[PDB]
Amino acid sequence: PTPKYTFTERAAAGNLSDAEILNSNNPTGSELPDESDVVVGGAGIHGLIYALHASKYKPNNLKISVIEKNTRPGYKIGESTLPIFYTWCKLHGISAAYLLRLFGLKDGLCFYFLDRENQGQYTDFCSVGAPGLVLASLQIERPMSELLFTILAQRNGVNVYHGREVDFKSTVVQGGGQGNKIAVSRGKYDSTPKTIDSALFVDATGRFRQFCSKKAPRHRFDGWNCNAFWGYFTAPKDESKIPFDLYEGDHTNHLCFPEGWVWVIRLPSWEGSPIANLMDMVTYILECADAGVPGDELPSSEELARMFGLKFQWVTSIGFAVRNDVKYPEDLSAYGTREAEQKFNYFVQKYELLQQFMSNFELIENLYGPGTTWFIRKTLAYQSPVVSGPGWLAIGDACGFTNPLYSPGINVGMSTSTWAAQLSHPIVEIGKSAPADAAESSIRKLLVPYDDYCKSLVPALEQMNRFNYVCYRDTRLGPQVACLWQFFAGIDRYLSDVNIETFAHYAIKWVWGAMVPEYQQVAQKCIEHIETVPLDERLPDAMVDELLAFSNRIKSAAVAADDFSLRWDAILRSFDRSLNFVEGKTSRDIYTRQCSGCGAWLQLRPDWKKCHSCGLLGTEPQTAVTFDPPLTAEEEALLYAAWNTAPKYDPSKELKLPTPTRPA
Numbered sequence: 001p002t003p004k005y006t007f008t009e010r011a012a013a014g015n016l017s018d019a020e021i022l023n024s025n026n027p028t029g030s031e032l033p034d035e036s037d038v039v040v041g042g043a044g045i046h047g048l049i050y051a052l053h054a055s056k057y058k059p060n061n062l063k064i065s066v067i068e069k070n071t072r073p074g075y076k077i078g079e080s081t082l083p084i085f086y087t088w089c090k091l092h093g094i095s096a097a098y099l100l101r102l103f104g105l106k107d108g109l110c111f112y113f114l115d116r117e118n119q120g121q122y123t124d125f126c127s128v129g130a131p132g133l134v135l136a137s138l139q140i141e142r143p144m145s146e147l148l149f150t151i152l153a154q155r156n157g158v159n160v161y162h163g164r165e166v167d168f169k170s171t172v173v174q175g176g177g178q179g180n181k182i183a184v185s186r187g188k189y190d191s192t193p194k195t196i197d198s199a200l201f202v203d204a205t206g207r208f209r210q211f212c213s214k215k216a217p218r219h220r221f222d223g224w225n226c227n228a229f230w231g232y233f234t235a236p237k238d239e240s241k242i243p244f245d246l247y248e249g250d251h252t253n254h255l256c257f258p259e260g261w262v263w264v265i266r267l268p269s270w271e272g273s274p275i276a277n278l279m280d281m282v283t284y285i286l287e288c289a290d291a292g293v294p295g296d297e298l299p300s301s302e303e304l305a306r307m308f309g310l311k312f313q314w315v316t317s318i319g320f321a322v323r324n325d326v327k328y329p330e331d332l333s334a335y336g337t338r339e340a341e342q343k344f345n346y347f348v349q350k351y352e353l354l355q356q357f358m359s360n361f362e363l364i365e366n367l368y369g370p371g372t373t374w375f376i377r378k379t380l381a382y383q384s385p386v387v388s389g390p391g392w393l394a395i396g397d398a399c400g401f402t403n404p405l406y407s408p409g410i411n412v413g414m415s416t417s418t419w420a421a422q423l424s425h426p427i428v429e430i431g432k433s434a435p436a437d438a439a440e441s442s443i444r445k446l447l448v449p450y451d452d453y454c455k456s457l458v459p460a461l462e463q464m465n466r467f468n469y470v471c472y473r474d475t476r477l478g479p480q481v482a483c484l485w486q487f488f489a490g491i492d493r494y495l496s497d498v499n500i501e502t503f504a505h506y507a508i509k510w511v512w513g514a515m516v517p518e519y520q521q522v523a524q525k526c527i528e529h530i531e532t533v534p535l536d537e538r539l540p541d542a543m544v545d546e547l548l549a550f551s552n553r554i555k556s557a558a559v560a561a562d563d564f565s566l567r568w569d570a571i572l573r574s575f576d577r578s579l580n581f582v583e584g585k586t587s588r589d590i591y592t593r594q595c596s597g598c599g600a601w602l603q604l605r606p607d608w609k610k611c612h613s614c615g616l617l618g619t620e621p622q623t624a625v626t627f628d629p630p631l632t633a634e635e636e637a638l639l640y641a642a643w644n645t646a647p648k649y650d651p652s653k654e655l656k657l658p659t660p661t662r663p664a
């Protein structure tokens with residue numbers, strides 16, 4: 001495919017603003033339609049996942065318009081994604097070769113637990129991801145992912161309007177056949193707002209909860225909540241002076257301690273690129289995905305930046321998520337002039353390992369515009385008590401949120417977006433096919449399971465978050481209890497069976513394993529014990545012993561009961577096949593390598609000889625995965641065979657759940 005420069009030239013020829021060049025790619029045109037079946041408020045990641053999945057689940061059935069107030073895809077925190085999200089991208093026609101041009105490779109998850117009272121001591125818990133011929137995970141710059149999903153939506157019959165705001169004072173939402181009148185303006189100052197007549201409104205406005213807040217006050221859980229503060233840093237090519245043994249930058253790394261934890265995410269940034277040029281690059285990448293261009297014949301990230309006139313750099317996202325019962329010194333002016341900067345730098349010097357870690361990184365100023373060197377957000381976790389009603393439903397953050405830890409926000413939250421998308425088809429058809437009272441009653445009953453799932457989802461994630469946080473107060477409990485249980489209960493089994501038709505049904509059974517009974521039994525024992533010890537104290541050694549022994553006793557039975565075959569010892573560095581902790585164990589599968597030229601992390605597979613990021617040819621041998629323990633040639637062939645293409649939809653197959661086998 002020869003690259004085209006359609007949008008770059010259109011924007012120049014017409015002197016078009018950012019919102020105007022984006023909206024010119026809409027199937028029905030750059031102006032709003034007078035009527036739609038579905039109007040989605042917000043084109044964050046979930047509003048777009050919703051619209052893409054709805055159209056892909058049943059094409060040419062619903063007219064869908066997405067309304068987004070940002071003039072172009074905006075900055076968002078929330079960069080780490082999991083196999084379920086990649087699989088969803090692949091089911092929607094974009095596999096790893098194309099996604100790695102845009103996003104950073106993520107291998108596994110790694111945790112380092114810092115002893116507070118013995119500064120310099122730490123332990124770790126280390127996992128790997130998957131072979132390159134199986135799948136990938138991704139570190140995503142959110143303005144780029146939202147651009148990707150906007151362009152893909154427009155190419156699949158969805159209209160997306162940037163620079164437009166839903167007016168929630170004058171919008172009318174009700175249970176009729178076509179009961180909704182969604183008022184859309186360019187802002188509060190706008191004298192000439194438009195109206196979209198429509199059947200279904202989807203609140204995808206995130207934590208702002210712009211519609212469902214009108215239906216119930218925000219709900220907070222008992223006890224402490226969290227605050228976060230974060231910034232963007234350089235990404236060293238040479239990671240060897242990082243003070244943690246065996247550190248690798250293509251994991252989502254977690255630095256954990258009694259007060260909370262630090263995320264570390266290496267990812268490429270496209271900031272500084274004109275939006276029209278980016279549209280041309282994304283469009284070209286989708287055309288290459290359609291044509292099946294092999295990864296070695298696809299331009300590298302840096303080559304795309306040259307071709308389309310873009311800016312490209314490697315950055316590290318680094319932030320704290322700490323409890324809000326931390327006591328800070330009255331005066332933090334020695335650590336900076338703003339609160340976020342102050343608390344960030346103050347926490348860094350409280351742990352010698354964090355200070356030694358951060359000394360490998362240089363702060364980037366205002367990566368996302370003026371005032372964005374530092375971010376702070378307070379009181380993270382909440383739930384919306386009402387997530388649907390006559391003429392509307394809510395998805396994603398607008399339903400509730402807990403914490404960045406284990407990335408439930410995107411990866412678990414897409415269970416709501418994709419289930420809502422599937423349910424939108426009968427919701428709209430019910431309204432077109434029955435009188436008003438019976439339609440409203442039948443839609444309400446259809447959505448009882450959706451409401452009940454959301455009601456139970458956020459509390460289960462909140463208990464999962466507290467479980468991990470309390471265990472992070474000790475360097476044995478963190479890795480040997482909390483991390484262990486999260487991976488045993490939450491690795492999504494039988495993901496290779498998922499397809500577009502079953503995706504929502506599978507996704508709502510996952511919940512990172514936070515519904516697994518044995519997981520909840522261990523979580524409650526730890527939370528109950530540890531919450532009685534003031535944060536400023538060290539856990540008594542006997543409490544750690546008792547909790548460790550209780551966790552292991554519950555673990556043995558639950559592991560024996562799981563009928564799922566998995567090389568646990570190759571995926572979890574510290575554990576054997578039966579999930580017993582092994583004190584010195586260091587062996588693991590090796591799926592990735594670092595480019596010697598640019599520092600980017602790459603997947604090992606025989607058909608990718610060149611770095612996808614800078615294009616530097618690596619030598620043929622380095623392409624080989626290391627399986628420890630070994631796999632035969634046949635076993636390796638069998639594994640790869642299960643991951644080429646997803647199964648066609650069979651309406652008689654029983655769905656295999658992602659969670660461990662019940663004991664019966």
Ligand SMILES: Cc1cc2nc3c(=O)[nH]c(=O)nc-3n(C[C@H](O)[C@H](O)[C@H](O)COP(=O)(O)OP(=O)(O)OC[C@H]3O[C@@H](n4cnc5c(N)ncnc54)[C@H](O)[C@@H]3O)c2cc1C
Pocket residue numbers: 041042043044045046047067068069070074076077078079080081164165166167168204205206207208210228319321377380395396397398401403404407408409410411413
């Ligand atoms: C510190 C922190 C770290 C996190 N890390 C991770 C992580 O590593 N991985 C992960 O999966 N999740 C993470 N999360 C959670 C994640 O950021 C969210 O779950 C996710 O961004 C939710 O997306 P959304 O589409 O629901 O809402 P958003 O992305 O917030 O989008 C809402 C959209 O609505 C628009 N909008 C608002 N009002 C209107 C209106 N009136 N009209 C039109 N548009 C409107 C906004 O412009 C915005 O684009 C993190 C959260 C925090 C706080």
Ligand SMILES: CC1(C)c2[nH]c3ccccc3c2C[C@@]23CN4CCC[C@]4(C[C@@H]12)C(=O)N3
Pocket residue numbers: 082083128129130131134490491492493494495566567571
């Ligand atoms: C199941 C899987 C999708 C998965 N889901 C996770 C969720 C959270 C954290 C880690 C994972 C993983 C790692 C796995 C384990 N499987 C071993 C054989 C194939 C596969 C697929 C993949 C693999 O190579 N890596």
Ligand SMILES: CC1(C)c2[nH]c3ccccc3c2C[C@@]23CN4CCC[C@]4(C[C@@H]12)C(=O)N3
Pocket residue numbers: 504505508651652653654655
């Ligand atoms: C299990 C079932 C009651 C169900 N439970 C859900 C929960 C959330 C979202 C969707 C579902 C569904 C739809 C299902 C999926 N199964 C495929 C084979 C038989 C069956 C039973 C039925 C079917 O035909 N439709």
Ligand SMILES: [Cl-]
Pocket residue numbers: 080081109252405406407
């Ligand atoms: Cl994660």
Ligand SMILES: [Zn+2]
Pocket residue numbers: 595596597598599600611612613614615616
């Ligand atoms: Zn390179």
